[PDB]
Amino acid sequence: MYAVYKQAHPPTGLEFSMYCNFFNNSERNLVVAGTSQLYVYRLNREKLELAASFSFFGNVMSMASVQLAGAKRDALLLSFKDAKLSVVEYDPGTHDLKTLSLHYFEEPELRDGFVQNVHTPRVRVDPDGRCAAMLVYGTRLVVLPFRRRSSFLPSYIIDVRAEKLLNIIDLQFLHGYYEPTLLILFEPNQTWPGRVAVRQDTCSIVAISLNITQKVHPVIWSLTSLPFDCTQALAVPKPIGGVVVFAVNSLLYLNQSVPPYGVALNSLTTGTTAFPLRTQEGVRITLDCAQATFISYDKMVISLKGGEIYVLTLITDGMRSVRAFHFDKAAASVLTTSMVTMEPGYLFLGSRLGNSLLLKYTEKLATYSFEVCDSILNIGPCANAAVGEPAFLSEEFQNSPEPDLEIVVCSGHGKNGALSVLQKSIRPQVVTTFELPGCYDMWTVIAPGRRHGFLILSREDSTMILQTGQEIMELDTSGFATQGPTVFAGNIGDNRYIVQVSPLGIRLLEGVNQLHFIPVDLGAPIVQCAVADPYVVIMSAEGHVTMFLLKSDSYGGRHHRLALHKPPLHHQSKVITLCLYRDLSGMFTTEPTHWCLLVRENGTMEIYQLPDWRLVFLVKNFPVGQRVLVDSSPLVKEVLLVALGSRQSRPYLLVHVDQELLIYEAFPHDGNLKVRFKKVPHNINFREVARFRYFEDIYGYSGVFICGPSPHWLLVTGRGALRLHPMAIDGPVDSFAPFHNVNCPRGFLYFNRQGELRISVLPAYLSYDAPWPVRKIPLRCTAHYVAYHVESKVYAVATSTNTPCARIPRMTEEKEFETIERDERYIHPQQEAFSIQLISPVSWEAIPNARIELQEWEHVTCMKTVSLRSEETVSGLKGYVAAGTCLMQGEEVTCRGRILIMDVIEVVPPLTKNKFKVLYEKEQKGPVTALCHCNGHLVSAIGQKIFLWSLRASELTGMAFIDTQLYIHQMISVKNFILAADVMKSISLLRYQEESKTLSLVSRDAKPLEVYSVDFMVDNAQLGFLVSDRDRNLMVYMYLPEAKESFGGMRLLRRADFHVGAHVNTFWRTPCRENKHITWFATLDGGIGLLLPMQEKTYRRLLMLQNALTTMLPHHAGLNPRAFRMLHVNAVRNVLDGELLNRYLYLSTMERSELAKKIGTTPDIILDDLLETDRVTAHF
Amino acid sequence: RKTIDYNPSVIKYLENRIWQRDQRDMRAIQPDAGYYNDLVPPIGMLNNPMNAVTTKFVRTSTNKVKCPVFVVRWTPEGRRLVTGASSGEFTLWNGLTFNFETILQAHDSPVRAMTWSHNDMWMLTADHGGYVKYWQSNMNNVKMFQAHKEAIREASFSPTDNKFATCSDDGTVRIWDFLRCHEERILRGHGADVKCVDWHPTKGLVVSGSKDSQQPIKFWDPKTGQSLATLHAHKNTVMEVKLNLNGNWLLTASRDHLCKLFDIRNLKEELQVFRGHKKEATAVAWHPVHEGLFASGGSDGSLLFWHVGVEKEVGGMEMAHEGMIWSLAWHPLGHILCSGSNDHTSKFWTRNRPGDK
């Protein structure tokens, strides 16, 4: 059973934040990493623009920066799983990431016999920049020295067990030492809170002076008996030059010169630490799972576990000795996983549990107010996902053969909990539709803040002019060129004058009356026309180019007319197409400049500056599609060079070659034009007059609409991130234009292939500046589960809030509650209160009086949409929302369950239309851990059993039960069968027989496996069981009674595996664009992937291609995708990467041809397979 | 009358997994009694095996007719704990409330060995000078088979569960096919009274430990029957021998008051010596979750807890029992450790509650 993996949505959970000189030593910028993605952001003066982004075949475990001896740029140190370490650096010649070095430290002798590593590779860099260190396996401290040929000295490994250095909590390089001094916070005799009465004060710190020349590392100073709950250590910069140790309930300042200074932060420090700790009066918090960065030498900001942002100031003498600590509850923000200071007054909080935030802090012994400047969207972690139909869809698209689908995800956590409504495709909100026969091309022109005045349509024999106002009315009387076709229509003179180019010449008019008309006869009719205010260029079918200029009158009266200016751009190579570009940015240099990009018959491409017509750029082989366009000294059908982003910041070059689309991002490099172009990867398929239609301010968004068989939207906002959103709910679009009207405020109009012109707008409430169009519904509470009720089109969302824990249940004697009595400084435990809300997709609001509050200490362990047997439906079944809850009173009390069946019923009302009705609500003997449906029956795991009930009226009648494993946390059923997932004992396949009323264990997998979630792989005439585990893997098992690999059909057999690199908790299946089902899933890092079952022969072909791609292509950080996709952290493979297969589309035509030659196949065969896999997965 | 329920901890850990990458994201469990719902099973804190040091006595379980308990074993799912006593009796206790459930006269002789196959289908048992008995999941015997004419001390299953090895008091280790009731091969390279035997989790080799002072530990090839090597780990009799699930480590417990750890690849030097007891060391149990943690029991009623990386003992109870501890069994989750001793009782031990004095 073979399949291909595809990444439909990249992860959005960030983990590391850094501030360094990535591009050059002049400007510093932000570098943020999340799992397999790395981003370089610049700051606008308030927005972060994505300056660069790179993907890895590996998960970044640690990130750091260093300034090497050459000092061209900063080098980046990236840790990867087990013991891989990569030094990388920006390549100015290719706008890419160049691998300086890659080091493997994966040897079993370094693991001391252990096979399971619970330690991540932790990298630290000495502040002076003389060496780096990486703690691996918690046992081996790798030291990479730096020169003060190769820029790196040979590394050497220090065995920390040479003292009794064990269980290292943290390590950090220190400031102010002449040798790299590394402080290590650890604990020789490990302890845990329950055993704190026997072992406490177990932590210790040891500072190591590293001499890299002699490889000598003595201990300069050490401290023992530090509080057991020490969490991390922060190096204090000059001139204070100490170490600040965080501990769950305490704060320490340590240094060689002064005895330690310890401060208790709450009451819980009493009886747990014998360390002398003075009490901080106005503070009552904890520092566990907190982040902190120095904003200056004297103050550092701390983001706590709950999002509280405090500012800590160090009080010093004249000789800089920390006398006291000063905290100040500055503000409250997101749950930060990372944090870094940028320019003075700016602080970045990176988060994977919420949207990352840029903050600006301003002062007013001195307090600081924090203000949110920018945010980076994040749909992770994706705890649970449901698929439903959107509430609003334009009538013209209803009754479509394909279903209109929409994803609703439980995203985030805690105060940053939310629902993410994802749609991949753009839906046009059609205001109205005109059916106009004969029109094949269109233009929209502003009449004389900017509202379009005229819509000019062209037809083989004529043209049509439409006045645009309160009504759109045909204009026959105007002085336009109504007779004959129109090849172009645009605006000149900053939207004061309008221009209409016809095959016989050019016409300059103002409003409805024409001011000027120049006949243009060059031996061939005019076939193309470009306009870059105030320059106009036209070209004929033979290849004659002409330029006109809009010149103001000498008396300043602003009367304008076109002036001929013949270009001296003669060449022996015939021009195919061209385009004009008005640069308001500063990239195009040799401040508004004018350029002409031109393609010729010999295959070359040229750029000329205007009006002197001077050559400044030349590419010898343009239609090949090289990955980097380099200056020197297949049918290129269309070309367009446009500026997008904030204030025309980023330039892009779109090229339409035969059945191929090319996107090029322009970047500065080095008489000649100091610009280069880098290819942008995409999956837009051109295979089946101007296909590229630029637009500005279509909904506050600037970009380009790409017409063709699969239309797309290309968007770049103030953030320099390219967005490619499909629009395929309507067929192939051949004509597009922007349109700002009083009835179509900031909108567009497009022609379909059935002759329908659609005046539409973009749907509001959706952010299109994201990988997928997304609507974020903040819940301010953890979203645990989401279910879609088909009959009512409403979502049931199970959420929770945190309250202070006040009582302790003591006996499962009789039920008794001890009231927790403490003092004011005590920090109460967090007690979860669960609720079930109804939310309507119409307004994405909660339905009033439709909220179910569950009992105290009652946790909702599962919530699914179930189809139970009912006699009121034609199908014999109807949908309910089923929930299983467990009342957890601690370990000493028996955990009793409860089943809760609800229905969403229609009631005479907007949001009042629907209401919750509790059809069933009964406490169960044993904890209710999972539930699903099977042939109209409700299957639920209770304790160590699984019961199958039938619902009749309002009562649940027990029909079957079976003994199961330790704890079943997930259950899903294909008709007649059931699949249950244990916490530790993998999956189990059961059968229910209606004749016997019995459950029979069909088979299972005896091997232990920490299953996260499970679902099905539905290939044609095949059934597989898809499992995710704790090691970020996917495995397809199968029940093959005749395979003999099973002892007697009782052993489930693994037939596919794949290291996705993320934890998957929610799957869902969709039909194929057969009998195949694409099994999509959402990851806990904010990403969406899919598994697509595939034929064996196509799998073999693409596997040969995959080996070719892994062996013949360079990969970031020097990693290798074959080893990245391997099992654990045995294997049968049978799952293609897809992310790796996409790079073949990124190769040039020559590279693709040579690669297919080495494989033994046709480039067209490879492209057919890849584009078909892309076509089948088009959903949402 | 006490009880411990693991479902709240499992539920809290399941709620943690969605928004916590690993243990560096888990919040701090305060050493306070109010933080009872923040507990998680061992798999919820792999960086702190200390949590699984179970020195908090919960419940003592004693049969109506008191007999020295020779073996204790949890059922694979952890539902019921079985105690095999000198009366030849299996006593089935509830795994959540530790109350008496059932009792069966399974053997006419003191049942010494009790093991569950890697697949949860079969339970194999053996008695003093007695026979090997197969047991379904429902505790119904399907096959009784004469294995040795003398006392069988222990048995262990092959990774595929198709075959199993038994060490007996005749100084031999016999290897049998499970589907049949046939004696495949004999291993006779010992002196007398082989008291412990263990099958490797992946590789095909079997370890045995006996009363012999010249050849205490011996390795064996199961299919071939050849003696791979001889390990002179102790001078007294080796009471227990267990291979870690990682396949690299070998743990032994002997009457010379010592536990020992060896690397299976290089046997020239002892990898580690666990010293800390008052008398002999009679029982050992590797933790099912934490790779380096294990428990031991001795001739005195003491039990101790050790970690592979640590020289000194990690914890334990000095007067846990009043007789010698014959058997130790971790609950499959790893939060309960049961001890079966010679004082006619079997006790249950759990992790210490945060805030305990």
Author numbering:
A (entry chain A): 1 to 45, 64 to 166, 182 to 195, 198 to 399, 458 to 541, 569 to 710, 780 to 822, 844 to 880, ...
B (entry chain B): 54 to 410
The article reads:
The key protein factor responsible for polyA site definition is the cleavage and polyadenylation specificity factor (CPSF), a multisubunit complex that specifically recognizes the AAUAAA motif, catalyzes pre-mRNA cleavage, and recruits PAP to initiate polyadenylation at the 3’ hydroxyl group of the upstream cleavage fragment.. In turn, CPSF160, WDR33, CPSF30 and Fip1 have been shown to form a stable complex independently of CPSF100 and CPSF73. Here, we present structural and functional insights into the assembly of the core AAUAAA-binding module of the human CPSF complex.
The structure revealed that CPSF160 is a multidomain protein composed of three seven-bladed WD40 beta-propeller domains (bP1, bP2 and bP3 for beta propeller 1 to 3) and a C-terminal helical domain (CTD). The three beta-propellers form a compact tristar arrangement, reminiscent of the domain arrangement observed in the DNA Damage Binding protein 1 (DDB1). The N- and C-terminal propellers (bP1 and bP3) are oriented in a pseudosymmetric fashion and interact with each other at a ~60° angle, creating a deep cavity in between. The cavity is closed on the distal side by three elongated loops (el1-el3) comprising residues P223-T237 (el1), L300-C324 (el2) and C1044-K1069 (el3) projecting from bP1 and bP3. WDR33 also forms a seven-bladed beta-propeller domain (corresponding to residues T108-T403) and additionally contains a ~50 residue N-terminal domain (NTD, residues R54-T107) protruding away from the beta-propeller. Upstream of the NTD, residues Q35-N53, which were included in the crystallized protein construct, are disordered in the crystal structure and could not be modeled. Overall, CPSF160 and WDR33 establish an extensive network of interactions encompassing 45 hydrogen bonds and 19 salt bridges, with a total buried surface of ~6900 Å2, equally distributed over the two proteins.
